[PDB]
Design a protein around this ligand. Sequence first.
Ligand SMILES: Cc1cn(-c2ccc3c(c2)CN(c2ncc(Cc4ccc(-n5cccn5)cc4)s2)CC3)c(C)n1
Ligand SMILES: Cc1cn(-c2ccc3c(c2)CN(c2ncc(Cc4ccc(-n5cccn5)cc4)s2)CC3)c(C)n1
Ligand SMILES: [Zn+2]
Ligand SMILES: [Zn+2]
Lengths: 298, 292
Amino acid sequence: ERLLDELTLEGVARYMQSERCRRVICLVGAGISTSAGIPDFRSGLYDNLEKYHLPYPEAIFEISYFKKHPEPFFALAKELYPGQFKPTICHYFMRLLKDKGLLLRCYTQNIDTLERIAGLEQEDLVEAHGTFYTSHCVSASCRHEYPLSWMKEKIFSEVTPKCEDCQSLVKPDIVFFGESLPARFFSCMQSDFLKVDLLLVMGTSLQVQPFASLISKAPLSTPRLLINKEKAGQSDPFLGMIMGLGGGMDFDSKKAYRDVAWLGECDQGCLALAELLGWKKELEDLVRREHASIDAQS
Amino acid sequence: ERLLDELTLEGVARYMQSERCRRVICLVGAGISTSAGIPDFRSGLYDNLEKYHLPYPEAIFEISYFKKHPEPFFALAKELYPGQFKPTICHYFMRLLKDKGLLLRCYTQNIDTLERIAGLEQEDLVEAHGTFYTSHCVSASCRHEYPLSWMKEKIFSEVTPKCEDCQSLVKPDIVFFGESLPARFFSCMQSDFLKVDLLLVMGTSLQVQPFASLISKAPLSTPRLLINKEKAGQSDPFLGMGGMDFDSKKAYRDVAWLGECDQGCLALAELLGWKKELEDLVRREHASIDAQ
Ligand SMILES: Cc1cn(-c2ccc3c(c2)CN(c2ncc(Cc4ccc(-n5cccn5)cc4)s2)CC3)c(C)n1
Ligand SMILES: Cc1cn(-c2ccc3c(c2)CN(c2ncc(Cc4ccc(-n5cccn5)cc4)s2)CC3)c(C)n1
Ligand SMILES: [Zn+2]
Ligand SMILES: [Zn+2]
């Protein structure tokens, strides 16, 4: 017998306010930051790198190429460095989940730091594709850590960032091609996916790793709500880690029992869910107060 | 245990010609059909999907959507239907493996039928992502089978293919999102990987199931040759899901050959003494295809 009374946003809200739902995991991608003006750094932003004649377009995000020729990456980083950092209604919805004791973890494939600006703490977060929040000297014997303020000053001054201690390259803690996913992802995912009562999957197409396969690590009974412009994750039998196990999203089949798709902008979906839960005024008041503070320090 | 004398194409060829190597498994993907003009149906084909008013781009390959609205799929099938079916050097290299009693199985993730055109038979093949070669009525109680010539005529005439028995939808035997991997795959994979002496992995980045799994099903002693345009796990960690070891101090059984699958197979054919047979086979088969 399935846990949701019906496969609708209304059924998820009732489940969230039941004793059965204590621990929520959020999986978030580029779709939660587009309303904050953060480009989807995956899906034409290369068309001002003429002077660099890259050997292939993706070389700019490949660790071995970066370490030999870091200048293209830092030129692009200046061009695309966000003009302001104003988290969205969706980011503040996750802050409410934390305040209400429901947030087990926010897994993010975003690098923009908006989860932290919205008030999620390191312990609440798994930055599965890394983050601009910190940067490190690349020299194995040194690994000196630098804050974003330091990296920003290097980016805007068009000075290739070098370590103060050893003068090696300093790289933002974002995952390049040819690097591993962060240690923190592997640690947290083996424990969190045992304890999860609800997966809230927002603003991700579920095409890139780890989220494309990670959805299949949830217990088969755990309800999953996708808030996104379109249905995503119906990828079986191609992307599940276990052959013959059907862990991909199923909104549409005869056997659908636990997956709900709410189609629209992540902000409007989060407002809709907040409204059902009786949290709409709290969420709007939170966004008003936080946005007002960000504008004031402008 | 090290079955290769050396981690080179020359060491693999010597091993293949030795009594120890009787049973070769090929894992082949989109990289073996690109030189034949077959698009990689996975990896800008999302651009002209706009015109179908799909609820999400992948709906065109999803079984529940297909059964309700088959017209977009069959319209794209007309657009992307190959203009010619000329198997590659790599396809004909696997035909030589069959003829010379070395081929245990060709596992393909390709749907283009070029393995069959090259002369691999059903018994030689596991079409792990299915195939356009046959189509079936989708009604559980009917399942009338249709050949590609029948499906092609429906696709080009822009007539939704309907069963001549029951008028249900007729679907190509390709794996849509929402379907199982083929019965044939589950049967063969549990037996073949006990008997395999050599894995020949060609034109696949091992990014999706079942190849992501199959790569590690061989005995730990079984040598593995990768012939591929790009290094194993190039787009790691964003598109990859044991794993192959060409280069570490512990490397003992994995060989990489980086380049076009055709050029890799010609190189290996050279060391086997099969190059003239292979070129003559391609010439004679392509000549016959052009004549018809
Ligand atoms: C399947 C696949 C994966 N990838 C892939 C892999 C690695 C990376 C990318 C994409 C894209 N990357 C970037 N893009 C633009 C960048 C400039 C930038 C972004 C943010 C900030 N920022 C400062 C403070 C807050 N945010 C400043 C500058 S960094 C990060 C590496 C591709 C291309 N396809
Ligand atoms: C992880 C993942 C999986 N997938 C995925 C899943 C299912 C399918 C696809 C891709 C691609 N599909 C297709 N592509 C083009 C097609 C037109 C076409 C192709 C061949 C011929 N042909 C006639 C004779 C010989 N070949 C005629 C028309 S059918 C088949 C279903 C994605 C997108 N990501
Ligand atoms: Zn240093
Ligand atoms: Zn029928």
